[PDB]
Amino acid sequence: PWPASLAALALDGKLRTDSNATAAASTDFGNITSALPAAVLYPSSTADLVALLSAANSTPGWPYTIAFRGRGHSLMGQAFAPGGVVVNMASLGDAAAPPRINVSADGRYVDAGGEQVWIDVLRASLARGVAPRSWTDYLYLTVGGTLSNAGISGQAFRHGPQISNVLEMDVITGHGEMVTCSKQLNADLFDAVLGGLGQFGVITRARIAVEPAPARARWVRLVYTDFAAFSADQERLTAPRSFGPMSYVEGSVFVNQSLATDLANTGFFTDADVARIVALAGERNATTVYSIEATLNYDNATAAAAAVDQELASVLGTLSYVEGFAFQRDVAYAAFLDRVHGEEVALNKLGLWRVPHPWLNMFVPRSRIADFDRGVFKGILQGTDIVGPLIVYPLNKSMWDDGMSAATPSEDVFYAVSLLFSSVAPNDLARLQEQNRRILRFCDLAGIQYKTYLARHTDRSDWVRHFGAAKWNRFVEMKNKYDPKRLLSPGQDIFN
Template sequence: MALSDGQLPWQWPKELEGKLRHDPETLSLASTDYGNIVHEKPLAVFYPSSIADISLLIKFSNSLPTPFTIAARGQAHSVDGQAMALNGVVVNMTELNNYRNGSGIVVSEKENYADVGGEQIWIDLLHAALQHGLTPLSWTDYLYLTVGGTLSNAGISGQTFLFGPQISNVHELDVITGKGDLVTCSAGNNSELFNAVLGGLGQFGIITRARIALGPAPTRANMNWLQAKWLRLVYRDFSAFSGDQEQLISLNGKSPDYLEGHLLLNKPPLDLSFYPPPDHPRISSLLTQDGILYILELAKYYDNHSHTIVDKEVEELLSGLKFVPTFKFERDVSYEDFLNRVPNEERALRSQARWDLPHPWLSMFVPKSRISDFDQGVLKDILLKQNLTAQGLELIFPINRNKWDDRMSAVTPDEDVFYAASLLQSSVIDHLEDLENQNNQILQFCKDSGIQVKLYLHKYKSQEEWMEHFGPKWKKFQQMKAEFDPRKLLSPGQEIFTN
């Protein structure tokens, strides 16, 4: 139960008071997130009119005998309440758009970077960069997420094998620490804070600016010619599917520009919209026989200079791959439409009133050495056999670990290649408990089988589990918390230091 102002053992400073909202509608909005599973009401929601306002809020909390917790909220795309602050204050980061007055993204064409407000969303950075013939290198599949939010986790997608996660493509940050200090940091300046914050789950500071590395877009001559050849290949055998993915991410200089894999499971609703309608019956026939198909999805970018050779490049990429013969499907779309492909699915879900359903997602990193065991024990013996009613997508694709910087807080399995496995399911009515039980069963299987997975975009239930998650990084993680947020104010929804 949230406290009211009349119950508070302090008075808000005048500089803050007018920027705090306590009305039921605002508090209700701040007490839910995309997951729609956890609901925790804050004391207030803070609408900053400047960066200095956030610093003042944090310093005021630090001045109290018993401080209140503070959570930065961007798009609140978390699924386990990570953007919430029970009886604390939620900072509405998007309000900084008004403060910046359109200057939240500044592109340096000469230096190939963009200075981006932590509250800005990636789709807007894409648009701004393309105006200068540039593009960010690493993405998430969904671009309507804030820069500060994804950098607090890692930020992965089908480009991660090539360029690393988004946190590997940052030159510099402005961070307001848990003490209220505004600090500019980079790999060479205040490096401990820089490395701690990247992948640090919001524990050490609030990102207010990030300097993001940009690369040249495939052409500067005619942006309308910036295209993607988008392919999906169908596999019946997991070892062929995983082997081909691993081969493709090892092709230095000749790899695809994007690579992910996902599953087709023989359960409704079956989405075959990517494929030509005349091919639906034969895909469905394979799926009926096997129950599960593996889809290798890749893209190759081209422009008005390379469009004459892109088909030959794709043919060379596919040479020797072991997908089912004649089950190759491709589209030509614009570069932007390819990167921003998820909103089409979002619109469909919203039209079916499915967007706001609970989302008991389970995402993890799986060591390459155990991925076949994961396929048999999780994908076949649990997902396929239980066949629970749910709508969603199951992703599985390999990542090169040498593209990650181990000095940063983000944690991965200790193998040269590991897989991102994400079960992105939406619950239908009365099925949330079934899906949560299934997630627990999957984690228990991995534990019992000795598959040392690392959870991603998920929170553990105890500090002991967090300690196990961070492993050798835990001691440093604790030290950085004591250094930059000694009173444990920030990001309480992660429940790392609150249990």
């Protein structure tokens, strides 16, 4: 038997079983794994989500796992529901009204539906002169999706990840109950869901912190051939003072074998800049080149320009990049934030965007980053042609709430390391997959206490080590409380 509300969804054509629907929700950005669901839900309101979850919660023996598809940027099927039901979250925002993004009257925050993509949260905020403080490198991701992970970019060192910039949320648990939570209300759910990997319920609304919107961003890249100087400078720029003046700080690694090509593909350096950097590497006999990427946000004041120059000159004076290797660009704030969109459009036309992405994302404690550099950037990765950015930058643990579900190293400073490999060449995917296991194996043998991010483990003992035994027990407790049937986001392979 079907509950009245569940059957109603079928009549209205919200529950689709046709191969067209199920196929679209069977693949993700990773383009490595795939799994067909039994059906796809195209909800028009949060009421439809309650109906589905209430049904599953009340129906004994309910055999349908449920996942919430934001924009499917998952890499290894985290948004699939094998033989289950996939919720097409975007459907919540098709109705021209009411709005799914509402900037508060006082301009202190912005309410956004869990299905909304950050690029739109940004446009709706800028219209009101404000903007979120913490981002992801790419804006075409959903609010609920990044919040289910962490959401990190070059601003996290001073504002923490996106999960540290949420005032409250509306969540529908695995029991089908609508609950509003925050640090002062149903905190248990609030903490569990943030970085919760969609295991406790679906986020329908998230209240995101905002700050006055800067007009422009002075964007710079500094070049190094010495990793010690590179990492020391990133740490200096992101160290607590209160923080330095930089609004964003990330870094990049360029292996020698594909140096000229990777520098050109940054979309930042001119061919003249590239030639100078390639010559520098040859002079130093470097097998790797490093670049710090940073910005300084500022407004359209009359003195702003001159002030930014002074501020930058001052900051750069405290650094140790190679003399004369500082490169600047000045752009509108929104242009900087949406910089990766340009990369997608480009690569997609060449058929180089929708290809396998055996990405490796991890947090490495500061005390072992130099060892990681030697073993990976100067070791394992040498002798290969790399297409895709190799991003590395420090984060401050003080901005992360360990009470939340996100797991991080124990050190005060740890690095986000994102090796965004693209299997652009033919079946070059097997090589890349084996290479990532080799990197992980190298870290295990060297005793590096890293934490994987954006990855799902197919073995229980691995998830326990990921969270940590005590934190794991907590995760399980919260699981037996909000989704005892183990139906939500089975693609994480945690309880499924």
